[PDB]
Design a protein around this ligand. Sequence first.
Ligand SMILES: *[C@@H]1O[C@H](CO)[C@@H](O)[C@H](O)[C@H]1NC(C)=O
Ligand SMILES: *[C@@H]1O[C@H](CO)[C@@H](O)[C@H](O)[C@H]1NC(C)=O
Ligand SMILES: *[C@@H]1O[C@H](CO)[C@@H](O)[C@H](O)[C@H]1NC(C)=O
Ligand SMILES: *[C@@H]1O[C@H](CO)[C@@H](O)[C@H](O)[C@H]1NC(C)=O
Ligand SMILES: [Mg+2]
Ligand SMILES: [Mg+2]
Length: 619
Amino acid sequence: GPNICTTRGVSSCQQCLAVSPMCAWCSDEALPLGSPRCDLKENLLKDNCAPESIEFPVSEARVLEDRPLSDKGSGDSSQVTQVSPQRIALRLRPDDSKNFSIQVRQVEDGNVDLVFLFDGSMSLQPDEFQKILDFMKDVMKKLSNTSYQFAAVQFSTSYKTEFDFSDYVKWKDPDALLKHVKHMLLLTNTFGAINYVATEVFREELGARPDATKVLIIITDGEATDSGNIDAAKDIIRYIIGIGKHFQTKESQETLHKFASKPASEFVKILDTFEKLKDLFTELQKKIRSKVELEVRDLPEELSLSFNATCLNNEVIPGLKSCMGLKIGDTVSFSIEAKVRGCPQEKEKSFTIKPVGFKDSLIVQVTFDCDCACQAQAEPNSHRCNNGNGTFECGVCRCGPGWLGSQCECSEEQDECSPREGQPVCSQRGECLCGQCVCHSSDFGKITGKYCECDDFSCVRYKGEMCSGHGQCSCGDCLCDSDWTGYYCNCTTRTDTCMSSNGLLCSGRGKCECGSCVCIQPGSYGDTCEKCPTCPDACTFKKECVECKKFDRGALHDENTCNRYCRDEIESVKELKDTGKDAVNCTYKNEDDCVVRFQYYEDSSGKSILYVVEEPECP
Ligand SMILES: *[C@@H]1O[C@H](CO)[C@@H](O)[C@H](O)[C@H]1NC(C)=O
Ligand SMILES: *[C@@H]1O[C@H](CO)[C@@H](O)[C@H](O)[C@H]1NC(C)=O
Ligand SMILES: *[C@@H]1O[C@H](CO)[C@@H](O)[C@H](O)[C@H]1NC(C)=O
Ligand SMILES: *[C@@H]1O[C@H](CO)[C@@H](O)[C@H](O)[C@H]1NC(C)=O
Ligand SMILES: [Mg+2]
Ligand SMILES: [Mg+2]
């Protein structure tokens, strides 16, 4: 029956391909007249069309470079590959989309250039400054004769490279490398320091390796005294340690989030004392190699991408471009859908997909396949179209100016210019010539269609932009980019703003729709459905947070995931009180077999709170 390949008044092979990626064009000359030439390939074969004449391009994502992900090579012979594939050729027909995938692995023996950026401000006592030095020495000694190479920068009011990568490779001894450090005893210009590291330290001239993953360990005891941005360090993995009394308040700790990589729970470490630097190495090493985050570079306007992530145990999480909690050697995979808007005239485009901090990347070469191959057999001024009037292109007559018709015979001088006899001709947007509608020009776009009923400028708008600027208008209907859905193309496919602290989209208690959680589990609420005093498992989950946050013990403390999973503030109380229905009371026995008692409460300002009785009830 009817079909949009047939209901658009297409009069060429190129037009036929441009109306939809599902359309095919029949071009054999010995074809019945009343048969549509632009149709589905199946219906194009319902009537006998020559198979060598059906023009039907297929989009492809052709893998070109596919060096495998490196396993456990020790001498860095044959070189390390941490992204695969490395180069893909993407060819798209008009408005089409195409899948491809990328695999990323943090290889154990992959090179790492690590820079210590350590605070030398006037707040630090001599022994505290010395404990910062001993911590840098401890990290280096435990990573001696590995793929790690090191530099160290002291920062206060100004910045000083105390030793560079070339120094480390040559001398190796941390005692000798840091023997000449003089405590600056000034301010805490953390912005300028990080910018200094990005542009002045990670340099080949100073021994930085171009293939190495870049890591920055920042050690500080006070809030920054300068301002600005650290955009120049966005391709560096940044782990910050805030030590001491000046980071007692939650507010002060959060001022460090802007300097570290995301999320803060993995890359911001708060220590109450300097003595705890002695026990940090193992946690630190796991954290700095636990995140894979894809970044898209040089994406042309006409292309759109959406991502699904496979981070753990082959589980697909849609709408995500990153993975966290990774162990060294883990492999993650992403499924990527690329879509083009229309058909760009440009020769060839290419963008890159690269994990943050990594050298290796996937280069995606993009070409477009919008023309029919039969156009190479186009004869202008053809005897098959009247007085050489036009071209016999792919089995039809592309007529010249002034005269139209099947063979370009009708000039100035019938019936079908209206869907029925009552309506005006050509939707009052075109003129009826030679029995066909020739649509008026428009200042806002193009009017097309058999009856000039289609245009590309009257789609619904959202916030002043047609199709929210995230889709193309095709005969009054928005055709959304790959990363948008909805009648208005204003519903994002991304789900990162739905990810909850427990690692599940909408805490596993709801569904992500347009990037916002719709909570389904009864009694659940909050932005990611993470608040649920009446949920039956609330006590057993909050119990682990009382252990790690208040008592510095438990599974979450040992696994270094207390910051990740435990976002509720803890308040010590002498007793639990009647705080209303938005709470639950919990008890459990500690390893001394004394009863711990606490209340999970949801506060009217939006804060989850755990009220913990100060003294456990012992025998
Ligand atoms: C790509 O793969 C996804 C799931 O992996 C599927 O939903 C989709 O239809 C596939 N094709 C395109 C063109 O995205
Ligand atoms: C992502 O998964 C959703 C289903 O969860 C699917 O509709 C979509 O096509 C997938 N996209 C890709 C690029 O795999
Ligand atoms: C999309 O636009 C429509 C119309 O303006 C609006 O009603 C709807 O809430 C929007 N959706 C989103 C997710 O912004
Ligand atoms: C928690 O315990 C307090 C004190 O015994 C009590 O008043 C309150 O009703 C309890 N909360 C709930 C939600 O039952
Ligand atoms: Mg020396
Ligand atoms: Mg200080």
